[model samples]
Target: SMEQVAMELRLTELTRLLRSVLDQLQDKDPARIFAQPVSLKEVPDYLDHIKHPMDFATMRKRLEAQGYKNLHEFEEDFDLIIDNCMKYNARDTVFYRAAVRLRDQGGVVLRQARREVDSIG
Candidate 1:
């Protein structure tokens, strides 16, 4: 089951990479943050290039056992990872909220860019 799930996730990651590349190509703004040129064929092997604190293999095993189907589920399950990373002594939670706001803003930017492209072409 773990192997099957891993295969599925690997495929999902591949799809995300391809979609991201297409989005970048369609995006008109030169200064967009994540719009760096990428060749879709190179994405699967590029997985090794990502550096993270957690062991991906172990995490994948655990997530598969727990039936975490998608990125949102994984995010919910591992939200404490984000919380721990932002564990400054401050009780205000401003930084956490700011990170979420920034994520939302990124979505807004993408939507606006899509609309602009739709209008232009």
Candidate 2:
């Protein structure tokens, strides 16, 4: 059971890192546009345009559910959220602008987390 204990302890560090990253993004999203999943009715052709959609609420649920295997998985989902927005919205749109900002700002948060994750034994 020693290995299991180590695994669980490592998971705790990962979950904490992931949660902090998500929190930073939520705080940055003042408009709360990224707070919830994108609905088809709310935005026409959304499903057709974006194959993989993501949101803060879904990320939070996944984190709590232990759906994420590692910090990389969380990072992938985070990237999907921003990438989907950039792909769906035009460059001139506010959505695209916001995604850019998130990518720039949230990116630093991710980088710092990466260093912290690497330091974890």
Candidate 3:
């Protein structure tokens, strides 16, 4: 697994930064991460934008086939994707890609993480 380790080890800091900011982001505002959805129909589409489309699709199915019962469930789904990306750390470049994707998507967590980083940076 040296290859996997090499890939994963490279972005260890990125994953940690993402995880750290994400934790704080959630602590600050569960509402955004856990917002009530009008419909779950658009969810797979969002997941579609993630690192591994087919694999993420399967993860979504296994996580909750019917749909997200609540926003926390959705957050859990995101966590699964992010964690997987953190694993092999392939050019899919899962973690950072998701971070940039979500950041661009514009949400409470990454926006705030940006603000937090900007303040210190």
Candidate 4:
């Protein structure tokens, strides 16, 4: 029971940490660039270029559905959004620049979460 308790504790903290990271991204995304899926109407060839597309809207839905089995899965999806942005947009474009900033900020959040998890152990 004690072991199970620890597992639950970790799970709770992990879920909250992941959600907070998403929340922070949304807060910083003033352009609403990562707020939702890239529009096929706007970028007709987006899907052809990106095999796997991810956005904040989809991430939030997946989180609510408990689609992520672990925090690594959550991080992968988050990274995918930035990766896709960089792959699809030119370096000088606003999209690419925002992706760069978000990628760094996301890394910081993940590192903070890991430190917190380690301290809990």
Candidate 5:
């Protein structure tokens, strides 16, 4: 879905990307060794409960330890993470990469994704 331009995409896939990626971090899934809140929306509060490594606690700590503040700092850290780590695992991390892209694209993509889902019903 990403290889093509954004104009040629489905919003549902973006929502799927958000839900899929958020589910992993929210549930502390083991598929990934770490989680960093990519695209901030106000839901799936990771602070309600979470663990290390598989959750954002560890990455958040790493961010705090670096004297960084705000989601912008967190977003930059995640950019580095995906570019450095997932770049090699591209084929295996399609949903994740898409989530990052959609997240970075901001509310327009998120809103459009919601609109797509709403239209389906």
Candidate 6:
């Protein structure tokens, strides 16, 4: 349940970050440079619907075709988004500590995911 919840929350945070970036771009005149539209609700659905990661890459290309230049921008945004989300939930340190403990207990898979969540947070 925690994994599912974290995934959903991360998705939401990613959506928010994309939307904010798009909104910021909208203020500029498109005649000089086009401002792309990013639909928040579409991301996770697209990710889920795709049969392979390459399909996701194809979808990303489609977005880039609309004028988005940098896909790597999402990485930092995702990190910040996760951190902010964890802070809002007041679970940043707790999650990190618990993850470390779980890692020590030898729950390898769980530890990996928890550590990822903790580090990203």
- RMSD of every prediction: 13.7, 1.3, 14.4, 2.5, 15.8, 19.2
Model 5 global lDDT (CA atoms, 0 to 1): 0.42
User: How would the candidate models be sorted by TM-score, starting from the highest?
Assistant: 2, 4, 5, 3, 6, 1
Top model by lDDT, which number?
Answer: 2
Please give the CA lDDT of all the candidate structures.
0.41, 0.86, 0.45, 0.83, 0.42, 0.37
Per-residue lDDT tens digits of candidate 5, residues 6-95? 533433343344444334333433444335443226434533432211225545455334434333444454444444434333545764
User: Which pairs of residues collide in model 5?
Assistant: none
Task: Give candidate 5's root-mean-square deviation (CA, Å).
Answer: 15.8
lDDT of 4 by residue, 12-106 (tens): 66677668877976776778899899999998988899999999999999976656667679889988999999999999999999999888767
- Model 1's alpha-carbon lDDT is 0.41
Every model's TM-score: 0.25, 0.92, 0.29, 0.82, 0.31, 0.29
Query: By TM-score, is 1 or 3 better?
Result: 3
Q: Evaluated with TM-score, which candidate comes out highest?
A: 2
* Alpha-carbon lDDT of model 2: 0.86
Task: State how far residue 25 of model 4 sits from its true place (Å).
Answer: 2.7
Q: After superposition, how far is residue 58 of candidate 2 from its true place, in Å?
A: 0.6
Model 2 spans > 4 angstroms off: none
Better of 1 and 3 by lDDT: 3
In TM-score terms, candidate 4 sits at 0.82
* Model 6 TM-score, all chains together: 0.29
Alpha-carbon shift of residue 35 in model 2 (angstroms): 0.6
Can you tell me which runs of candidate 6 are displaced by over 4 Å?
Answer: 30-121
Q: What's model 4's lDDT at 11?
A: 73
Clashing pairs in 6: none
Candidate 1 shows a clash count of: 0
How well does candidate 2 score on lDDT at residue 62?
94
Any residue pairs clashing in model 1, and if so which? none
